[PDB]
Amino acid sequence: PALTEAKHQQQFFQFRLSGQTIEVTSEYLFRHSDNELLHWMVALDGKPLASGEVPLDVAPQGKQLIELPELPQPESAGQLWLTVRVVQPNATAWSEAGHISAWQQWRLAENLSVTLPAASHAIPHLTTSEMDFCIELGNKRWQFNRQSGFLSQMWIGDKKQLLTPLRDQFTRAPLDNDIGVSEIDPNAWVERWKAAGHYQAEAALLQCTADTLADAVLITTAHAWQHQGKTLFISRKTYRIDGSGQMAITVDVEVASDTPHPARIGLNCQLAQVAERVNWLGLGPQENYPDRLTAACFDRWDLPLSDMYTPYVFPSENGLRCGTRELNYGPHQWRGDFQFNISRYSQQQLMETSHRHLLHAEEGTWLNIDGFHMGIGGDDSWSPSVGRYHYQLVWCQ
Amino acid sequence: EAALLQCTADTLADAVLITTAHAWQHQGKTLFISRKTYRIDGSGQMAITVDVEVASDTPHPARIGLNCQLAQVAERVNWLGLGPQENYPDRLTAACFDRWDLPLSDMYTPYVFPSENGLRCGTRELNYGPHQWRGDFQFNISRYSQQQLMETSHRHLLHAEEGTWLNIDGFHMGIGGDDSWSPSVGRYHYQLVWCQ
């Protein structure tokens, strides 16, 4: 996967956008771009709207201005995107016909989301019990354990959906950079995390549990993760299931300053559904990270579940897709603006297992939808190379 | 122009919940959308969570926060945060975090050309008269409205408006300062607690 990012970052053609025209500059110094053909496309939240091809004729170290046609200006809500791709139509001594040499993207005019009425007409009588809060809307049921403060099980009719309760994950598997030269290096990031006890922090349940409203049921909870008595993180969640079945979860997370920065902020679980493909609208199709999202392209991507995990010999945190405004996997769908990875292996198994060939496919599917995540670094592999946060997620089907 | 919406909620077990949103549009194009949530408990503490989204195509908004004009006119302003002199996100280096108390006159700096001033960032707790606001924000307090500051070209022409003006902002851009002939400087959320 790193090859694609290197290819994108090493392209010979840099692009600048000025209104409608496009400025194309060639880094070649002796040769003319006589074997290139630009392909520009317009997409509104994934669906293409307009496209065209402009052959490239730019002198070495020169500039070429490409005047686009009258681009569409739809009134539909969303973000318009301009994707330009330079393609070599003729096969060279080292390439095939239609070779892609460079591509770049820009954000065009964005129309703020307009209509989105939540709920229809359903005051849900959440079954208040001592051990859990049970909420039922037709064939759909959600269970909220009152002793752990986490979503235990959700129902689509009869079949179960969650093999692991929805919990927050502050940790990611060992990273070569984090490891540095540890096996113990005090400045290693994973060693600092272990010393802070983030991997062994225990969630302590609290309360704030709320009740139903006019057309929905409101759940408000908070937890305290403490390692040997010191509170590392505190997060306050808010769960909102409307009459249409859409579940909105707002989580606000605070972090102690003295502790090292947490690896990730987001939710983790193990779904019972095992689908053959993963569909999302966001940066892709290959995996990406906050510090390595440059090569990632915003578009509606669909990949098989096998492609969702990269075959690194040393297992670690991988398969991450950032900037995902909408996710699709089986019957469920999550919307918003987040980053996620989906795989059949848990982070615990990734940490424990040293070789890829020793990895075993766990039951169901593992999901880690994270609001935020640090970069992976990469300046060097023997030293580090990389307070209050909130994320909003919408769960639908 | 702010266009009102709904989402208005109702009371809970020990409190009353209000949820609203507005749309600010200029000639039909929605510039910003913010969804607020107001929470008054049984102790009188009012918690206001506001989540703000901004259109990408529009230029970055100057500030995100709440504005009003209090009836109370107190002689001093007390806060715990960066100070005691005014500070800005790009010029908070000299600011020192401590419990500062200053008279209301010191809350406004006598720049001859009136503009946005008196800002105190990193204020975890604010005190002014009977009210008090806590959290993590930036604010300025003065007797002159931003409209009067924009309209008035000289300081000596400024007139003290009735009451006191407050602009508690969750976020604010820097002021720049590299040069004076060119610029030198999407989705946000703030939590405030109102008490007395």
XYZ file of C-alpha atoms in Angstrom:
593
model
C 0.000 0.000 0.000
C 2.895 2.405 0.629
C 3.843 2.173 -3.058
C 0.688 4.048 -4.082
C 1.380 6.866 -1.617
C 4.975 7.146 -2.828
C 3.763 7.234 -6.437
C 1.283 10.010 -5.662
C 3.820 12.085 -3.735
C 6.489 11.689 -6.445
C 4.343 12.750 -9.415
C 5.928 14.988 -12.052
C 2.822 17.190 -12.437
C 1.702 19.702 -9.813
C -1.693 21.368 -10.131
C -3.117 24.670 -8.898
C -6.799 25.616 -9.065
C -7.860 29.234 -9.682
C -11.629 29.459 -10.038
C -12.490 27.634 -13.259
C -9.064 27.335 -14.908
C -6.420 24.801 -13.863
C -2.683 25.516 -13.730
C -0.575 22.509 -14.760
C 3.187 22.584 -14.169
C 5.543 19.864 -15.408
C 8.635 18.905 -13.407
C 10.277 17.427 -16.511
C 13.318 19.382 -17.642
C 14.119 18.044 -21.134
C 11.060 16.162 -22.402
C 7.698 17.507 -23.523
C 4.457 15.991 -22.217
C 3.595 14.490 -25.600
C 2.198 11.242 -24.123
C -0.319 12.546 -21.580
C -4.046 13.294 -21.527
C -5.780 14.925 -18.564
C -9.084 13.476 -17.343
C -11.069 15.856 -15.134
C -14.293 14.755 -13.449
C -16.937 16.374 -11.245
C -18.613 14.402 -8.459
C -21.158 15.448 -5.825
C -20.727 13.207 -2.762
C -19.594 10.326 -4.959
C -21.960 10.465 -7.925
C -20.286 11.843 -11.076
C -21.846 14.916 -12.668
C -19.503 16.114 -15.430
C -16.193 15.057 -16.948
C -13.910 15.770 -19.878
C -10.491 15.165 -21.378
C -7.896 17.803 -22.264
C -4.645 16.717 -23.968
C -1.561 18.148 -22.283
C 1.010 20.285 -24.130
C 3.338 21.951 -21.606
C 7.005 22.845 -22.036
C 9.591 21.454 -19.589
C 9.528 23.514 -16.375
C 6.747 25.481 -18.082
C 3.115 26.092 -17.236
C -0.156 25.278 -18.974
C -3.539 26.779 -18.100
C -6.526 24.498 -18.737
C -9.886 26.268 -19.012
C -12.676 24.021 -17.765
C -16.167 24.129 -19.298
C -19.157 25.524 -17.398
C -19.074 23.167 -14.429
C -22.462 22.140 -12.999
C -23.694 24.040 -9.940
C -26.361 21.780 -8.421
C -28.616 22.980 -5.621
C -28.415 19.587 -3.889
C -26.761 19.518 -0.479
C -23.218 18.184 -0.293
C -19.632 18.895 -1.351
C -18.646 19.171 -5.004
C -15.289 17.598 -5.853
C -12.926 18.180 -8.782
C -10.727 15.173 -9.597
C -8.101 15.492 -12.338
C -6.135 12.473 -13.562
C -3.212 12.532 -15.994
C -3.204 9.365 -18.107
C -0.574 8.168 -20.587
C -2.668 6.756 -23.463
C 0.302 5.206 -25.302
C 2.306 2.362 -23.792
C 5.964 3.228 -23.225
C 9.024 1.010 -22.834
C 8.171 0.625 -19.125
C 4.390 1.165 -18.995
C 1.128 -0.047 -20.505
C -1.415 1.923 -22.514
C -3.516 4.151 -20.286
C -0.909 4.447 -17.532
C -1.820 6.842 -14.721
C 0.988 9.312 -14.014
C -0.565 11.840 -11.617
C -3.849 12.828 -10.010
C -5.063 15.513 -7.628
C -8.320 16.686 -6.073
C -9.938 19.902 -4.856
C -13.063 20.819 -2.913
C -15.525 22.845 -4.990
C -18.584 24.770 -3.789
C -20.281 22.982 -0.886
C -24.035 23.130 -0.265
C -24.806 22.799 3.459
C -26.934 19.706 4.247
C -30.574 20.947 4.056
C -33.546 18.660 4.940
C -32.983 15.754 7.408
C -36.103 15.376 9.679
C -35.310 12.820 12.436
C -38.076 10.444 13.740
C -41.675 10.056 12.493
C -44.325 9.508 15.227
C -43.151 7.012 17.884
C -42.860 7.695 21.663
C -40.804 4.600 22.695
C -41.651 3.114 26.122
C -38.072 2.064 26.937
C -38.425 -1.081 29.073
C -36.800 0.216 32.280
C -35.262 -2.758 34.094
C -32.655 -2.975 36.837
C -30.018 -4.763 34.735
C -30.438 -3.035 31.360
C -32.419 -0.411 29.469
C -34.363 -2.119 26.676
C -35.589 0.008 23.766
C -37.743 -1.520 21.017
C -38.888 0.079 17.749
C -40.747 -2.485 15.665
C -38.499 -5.413 14.793
C -35.438 -3.450 15.968
C -34.268 -3.660 19.579
C -31.310 -2.106 21.399
C -30.121 -3.215 24.844
C -28.068 -0.939 27.105
C -26.446 -2.656 30.081
C -26.803 -0.589 33.256
C -23.801 -2.163 35.018
C -21.200 -1.520 32.297
C -22.769 1.484 30.573
C -22.226 0.095 27.067
C -24.456 -1.109 24.240
C -24.689 -4.842 24.931
C -26.812 -6.228 22.084
C -28.927 -4.874 19.230
C -31.637 -6.826 17.417
C -32.806 -6.906 13.814
C -35.884 -9.029 14.365
C -34.426 -12.134 16.021
C -30.824 -12.417 14.798
C -28.192 -10.873 17.062
C -25.862 -8.174 15.733
C -23.167 -7.463 18.354
C -20.796 -10.238 19.402
C -18.847 -7.705 21.500
C -20.516 -4.773 23.304
C -19.887 -1.300 21.902
C -16.987 0.130 23.921
C -14.479 2.921 23.440
C -10.934 2.091 22.339
C -8.024 4.305 23.392
C -5.350 1.937 22.059
C -3.889 0.823 18.743
C -1.597 -2.208 18.160
C 2.257 -1.805 18.481
C 3.689 0.480 15.750
C 7.273 0.068 14.401
C 7.835 3.821 15.089
C 6.244 3.626 18.589
C 8.387 0.513 19.331
C 11.504 2.414 18.191
C 14.401 0.310 19.570
C 12.388 -1.278 22.433
C 11.949 -5.034 23.155
C 12.934 -1.402 27.137
C 13.230 2.077 25.633
C 11.607 4.675 27.936
C 10.979 7.137 25.094
C 9.237 4.519 22.930
C 5.600 5.475 22.428
C 4.209 2.004 23.158
C 6.378 1.832 26.284
C 5.037 5.211 27.425
C 1.479 4.008 26.792
C 2.145 0.846 28.813
C 3.649 2.886 31.658
C 0.575 5.131 31.633
C -1.550 1.973 31.663
C -3.697 2.909 28.668
C -3.647 -0.731 27.542
C -4.721 -1.777 31.063
C -7.032 1.118 31.959
C -10.311 -0.165 33.404
C -13.607 1.522 32.561
C -15.581 2.453 35.693
C -19.320 2.992 34.988
C -21.080 6.187 36.202
C -24.710 7.355 35.749
C -26.425 10.506 34.328
C -28.803 7.924 32.708
C -31.657 10.002 31.189
C -35.145 8.969 29.924
C -37.507 9.213 26.889
C -38.581 12.507 25.188
C -41.487 13.489 22.906
C -40.570 11.178 20.009
C -37.420 9.385 21.203
C -35.483 7.943 24.139
C -32.428 9.723 25.551
C -29.537 7.896 27.237
C -26.680 9.873 28.815
C -23.730 8.108 30.447
C -20.108 8.650 31.430
C -17.169 6.449 32.404
C -13.824 6.827 34.169
C -10.753 4.892 33.019
C -8.191 4.728 35.829
C -4.824 2.958 35.970
C -3.735 2.338 39.576
C -6.103 5.049 40.793
C -5.196 7.853 38.360
C -8.030 8.827 36.014
C -6.564 8.788 32.507
C -9.643 9.661 30.427
C -13.247 10.695 31.019
C -15.889 10.548 28.289
C -19.581 11.446 28.429
C -21.798 9.758 25.844
C -25.306 10.561 24.632
C -27.414 8.002 22.759
C -30.441 9.082 20.723
C -32.739 6.619 18.929
C -35.482 8.401 16.989
C -38.734 7.021 15.583
C -37.045 6.183 12.272
C -34.492 3.881 13.925
C -31.534 6.220 13.380
C -29.267 6.170 16.440
C -27.157 9.279 17.069
C -24.286 8.946 19.551
C -22.488 12.096 20.724
C -19.372 11.394 22.800
C -17.276 14.098 24.480
C -13.855 12.930 25.670
C -11.418 14.702 27.992
C -7.852 13.522 28.605
C -5.469 14.174 31.486
C -2.581 16.391 30.398
C 0.142 14.516 32.297
C -0.595 11.199 30.586
C 0.807 10.587 27.086
C -1.521 11.269 24.184
C -4.044 8.425 23.719
C -3.566 6.336 20.595
C -7.134 6.701 19.322
C -10.559 8.078 20.235
C -13.480 6.027 18.969
C -15.784 3.062 19.402
C -14.970 -0.633 19.028
C -17.144 -3.739 18.745
C -17.436 -7.092 16.971
C -20.395 -7.343 14.600
C -22.161 -10.649 14.027
C -22.674 -9.843 10.337
C -19.981 -11.154 7.979
C -20.441 -9.481 4.587
C -18.351 -10.051 1.472
C -17.708 -6.359 0.716
C -17.334 -2.993 2.444
C -18.807 0.157 0.887
C -17.977 3.700 1.957
C -17.945 7.276 0.680
C -14.664 8.920 1.614
C -10.914 8.799 1.165
C -9.652 5.623 -0.484
C -9.800 3.056 -1.917
C -6.482 2.034 -0.365
C -5.934 2.486 3.353
C -4.895 5.876 4.696
C -3.893 7.621 7.913
C -4.126 11.208 9.206
C -0.431 11.783 8.473
C -0.593 9.779 5.214
C -3.950 10.792 3.720
C -2.391 12.717 0.818
C -2.689 9.851 -1.676
C -6.217 9.057 -0.486
C -9.023 10.152 -2.816
C -12.536 11.104 -1.702
C -15.021 8.935 -3.614
C -17.612 6.215 -3.078
C -15.385 3.140 -2.753
C -16.422 -0.502 -2.429
C -13.899 -3.206 -1.559
C -14.088 -6.856 -0.504
C -13.492 -7.591 3.160
C -10.178 -9.248 2.266
C -8.915 -5.967 0.791
C -9.917 -4.218 4.036
C -6.818 -5.719 5.707
C -3.322 -5.300 4.289
C -1.044 -8.385 4.428
C 1.752 -6.952 6.540
C 3.881 -9.817 7.845
C 4.078 -8.198 11.286
C 0.442 -7.679 12.366
C -0.474 -4.251 13.721
C -3.106 -1.537 13.384
C -3.981 -1.410 9.687
C -6.855 -1.236 7.228
C -7.734 2.267 8.408
C -9.816 4.473 6.102
C -10.050 8.119 7.152
C -12.399 10.868 6.015
C -15.320 8.459 5.662
C -18.519 10.511 5.584
C -20.692 7.422 5.026
C -20.034 3.737 5.713
C -21.878 0.657 4.455
C -21.354 -2.913 5.661
C -24.139 -5.457 5.315
C -27.435 -4.047 6.581
C -26.005 -1.251 8.754
C -24.751 2.174 7.696
C -22.976 4.934 9.629
C -22.769 8.571 8.537
C -20.914 11.666 9.683
C -17.194 12.415 9.384
C -14.886 9.801 10.884
C -12.117 7.270 10.275
C -12.447 3.512 10.608
C -10.969 0.099 9.925
C -12.795 -3.200 9.447
C -11.139 -6.603 9.774
C -11.659 -10.136 11.055
C -8.803 -9.821 13.584
C -9.023 -8.031 16.919
C -6.431 -5.512 18.056
C -5.512 -7.896 20.885
C -4.720 -10.658 18.391
C -2.794 -8.169 16.246
C -0.664 -7.191 19.252
C -0.081 -10.776 20.401
C 0.619 -12.328 16.984
C 4.094 -11.632 15.595
C 3.683 -13.190 12.123
C 0.849 -12.728 9.642
C 0.664 -16.442 8.807
C -0.144 -17.158 12.471
C -3.223 -14.902 12.363
C -6.562 -16.698 12.688
C -9.899 -15.311 11.524
C -12.047 -14.450 14.534
C -15.800 -14.966 14.460
C -17.921 -12.149 13.092
C -16.321 -8.870 12.057
C -14.342 -6.343 14.103
C -15.077 -2.627 13.723
C -13.125 0.339 15.112
C -14.875 3.591 14.190
C -12.585 6.320 15.532
C -13.309 10.029 15.672
C -9.605 10.883 15.925
C -6.232 9.165 15.620
C -2.613 10.255 15.791
C -0.256 9.975 12.860
C 2.008 6.976 12.400
C 5.206 8.947 11.849
C 7.887 7.335 9.742
C 10.907 9.619 9.955
C 12.799 6.829 11.736
C 12.154 3.431 13.307
C 14.211 3.770 16.519
C 12.641 6.887 18.085
C 9.268 8.670 18.185
C 8.335 10.050 14.777
C 4.735 11.249 15.229
C -6.969 17.192 25.597
C -10.747 17.458 25.115
C -12.422 15.919 22.063
C -15.917 15.139 20.776
C -17.383 13.066 17.937
C -20.894 12.673 16.495
C -21.980 9.435 14.806
C -25.276 8.380 13.225
C -26.253 4.697 13.218
C -28.836 3.588 10.654
C -29.715 0.535 8.574
C -29.784 36.593 8.835
C -30.558 33.898 11.395
C -33.530 31.742 10.350
C -35.129 29.880 13.307
C -35.758 26.093 13.101
C -37.210 23.666 15.699
C -36.036 20.381 17.348
C -37.425 22.030 20.557
C -37.311 19.273 23.232
C -39.004 19.023 26.683
C -38.289 18.371 30.413
C -36.473 15.260 31.801
C -36.310 13.599 35.240
C -34.700 16.536 37.070
C -34.296 19.209 34.377
C -35.682 20.788 31.209
C -34.057 20.167 27.823
C -34.161 22.685 24.961
C -32.692 21.780 21.558
C -32.698 24.274 18.683
C -30.929 25.068 15.425
C -30.667 28.061 13.101
C -29.666 28.760 9.502
C -27.771 31.925 8.558
C -28.177 32.624 4.838
C -26.915 35.541 2.744
C -28.949 35.927 -0.464
C -30.147 32.332 -0.176
C -26.813 30.578 0.468
C -26.566 28.964 3.905
C -23.294 30.177 5.413
C -23.418 28.510 8.845
C -25.620 26.037 10.702
C -25.441 25.574 14.471
C -27.444 23.265 16.734
C -27.719 24.336 20.371
C -28.726 22.415 23.487
C -29.767 24.193 26.689
C -29.807 22.353 30.018
C -30.981 23.957 33.278
C -30.631 21.582 36.227
C -32.221 21.762 39.676
C -29.265 23.751 41.028
C -29.744 26.566 38.499
C -26.622 25.734 36.480
C -27.335 26.169 32.764
C -25.225 24.105 30.354
C -25.286 25.135 26.687
C -23.722 22.817 24.095
C -23.504 24.346 20.612
C -22.280 22.464 17.532
C -21.458 24.683 14.551
C -20.835 23.669 10.938
C -19.536 26.054 8.273
C -19.774 25.933 4.487
C -16.374 25.274 2.922
C -16.745 27.732 0.031
C -17.359 30.715 2.312
C -14.360 32.417 3.955
C -13.541 31.362 7.494
C -15.910 32.993 10.023
C -14.324 35.594 12.275
C -15.502 34.053 15.551
C -17.675 31.289 17.000
C -19.425 32.183 20.237
C -22.319 33.860 21.997
C -23.042 37.577 22.332
C -25.426 39.555 24.538
C -25.737 42.758 26.567
C -26.039 42.201 30.314
C -28.055 44.570 32.482
C -25.535 44.261 35.325
C -22.801 46.917 35.394
C -20.105 45.798 37.842
C -16.929 47.672 38.736
C -14.544 44.730 38.215
C -14.146 41.556 36.161
C -12.731 38.392 37.742
C -11.533 35.351 35.817
C -9.214 32.357 36.101
C -7.180 32.030 32.925
C -4.620 33.714 30.712
C -3.993 37.359 31.563
C -4.134 39.854 33.119
C -3.563 41.839 29.926
C -5.578 41.024 26.827
C -4.499 38.158 24.590
C -5.377 36.444 21.321
C -4.966 32.901 19.953
C -1.970 33.984 17.862
C -0.651 36.274 20.633
C -1.289 34.271 23.813
C 2.413 33.650 24.496
C 2.782 36.534 26.960
C -0.511 35.638 28.648
C -0.208 33.923 32.034
C -2.742 31.472 33.471
C -3.833 32.756 36.891
C -6.875 34.080 38.732
C -6.959 37.686 37.503
C -9.272 40.498 38.592
C -9.397 43.796 36.710
C -11.691 46.831 36.703
C -14.113 47.113 33.810
C -12.133 50.082 32.470
C -9.042 47.880 32.108
C -11.167 45.357 30.183
C -11.003 47.665 27.135
C -7.725 48.925 25.694
C -7.655 52.591 24.565
C -6.804 52.062 20.914
C -7.530 55.275 19.018
C -9.105 53.314 16.158
C -11.865 51.211 17.776
C -11.979 47.527 16.856
C -12.280 44.087 18.430
C -10.249 44.246 21.639
C -10.269 43.356 25.320
C -10.211 39.648 24.486
C -9.038 37.218 27.175
C -8.438 33.662 25.971
C -8.006 30.438 27.917
C -10.522 31.500 30.564
C -11.612 28.385 32.452
C -13.801 30.394 34.849
C -15.337 33.862 34.534
C -16.844 36.111 37.205
C -18.771 39.334 36.591
C -21.261 40.571 39.162
C -23.582 37.769 40.267
C -23.066 35.455 37.273
C -20.207 33.049 36.595
C -19.330 30.946 33.543
C -17.006 27.937 33.567
C -15.411 25.696 30.966
C -12.625 26.560 28.519
C -13.274 29.585 26.320
C -12.172 33.074 25.295
C -14.104 36.272 25.917
C -14.096 40.053 25.973
C -16.211 42.376 28.114
C -16.777 46.049 27.327
C -19.381 48.807 27.364
C -19.224 49.239 23.564
C -20.914 46.976 21.034
C -19.090 45.551 18.035
C -21.406 47.589 15.794
C -20.326 50.815 17.499
C -16.689 49.703 17.296
C -17.037 49.168 13.539
C -18.894 52.436 12.927
C -16.759 54.691 15.149
C -13.402 55.687 13.655
C -11.914 57.513 16.672
C -11.779 56.382 20.292
C -12.809 59.795 21.640
C -16.086 59.499 19.699
C -17.000 56.254 21.492
C -19.988 56.482 23.837
C -20.689 54.095 26.704
C -23.713 51.952 25.876
C -26.172 50.929 28.571
C -25.416 47.774 30.515
C -22.419 45.634 29.610
C -21.586 43.804 26.379
C -20.293 40.226 26.522
C -18.855 38.100 23.703
C -18.001 34.625 25.003
C -16.418 32.856 22.027
C -15.475 29.202 21.795
C -13.033 29.871 18.948
C -11.442 32.818 17.160
C -8.902 33.254 14.390
C -5.572 34.943 14.922
C -5.068 38.628 14.213
C -1.942 38.223 12.097
C 0.493 41.103 12.045
C 3.114 40.216 9.451
C 1.948 43.186 7.364
C -0.876 45.725 7.258
C -1.665 45.700 3.510
C -2.449 41.999 2.937
C -3.874 39.028 4.861
C -1.575 37.986 7.693
C -3.612 35.390 9.620
C -15.478 23.608 9.197
C -17.362 21.940 12.067
C -16.928 23.171 15.643
C -18.508 22.695 19.071
C -18.303 24.454 22.442
C -19.634 23.648 25.926
C -20.445 26.416 28.416
C -21.813 26.316 31.964
C -23.880 29.245 33.256
C -24.163 29.644 37.030
C -24.507 32.393 39.625
